[PDB]
Subunit: 55 residues, 2 copies
């Protein structure tokens, strides 16, 4: 029990590092996709602009 | 020791899902970095 009760502290320390790693890893994508929503509309407005301007 | 031995199993199968829900959430950040560059090479074609 002395060798196991340190390990249950160890894994519980790891999964309490794990979910917080998942938190910041979502926090980037939430920042990343939002500006990509701002950026991709620039391409679509440019697309209808040039194709009308082509002829 | 036996009911404790269930717990070390049931954490170890819990953290494996816990890293995967982190791991799958890493993939979309690789996806957004991929989609930006095909958006940007669409963009600089238009600005010229």
């Amino acid at each position: 029990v002395d060798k196991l009760q340190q390990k249950i502290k160890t894994y519980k320390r790891q999964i309490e590092e794990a979910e917080e790693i998942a938190a910041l890893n979502l926090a980037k994508f939430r920042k990343a996709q939002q500006e990509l929503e701002e950026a991709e509309e620039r391409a679509d407005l440019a697309e209808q602009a040039i194709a009308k301007f082509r002829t």
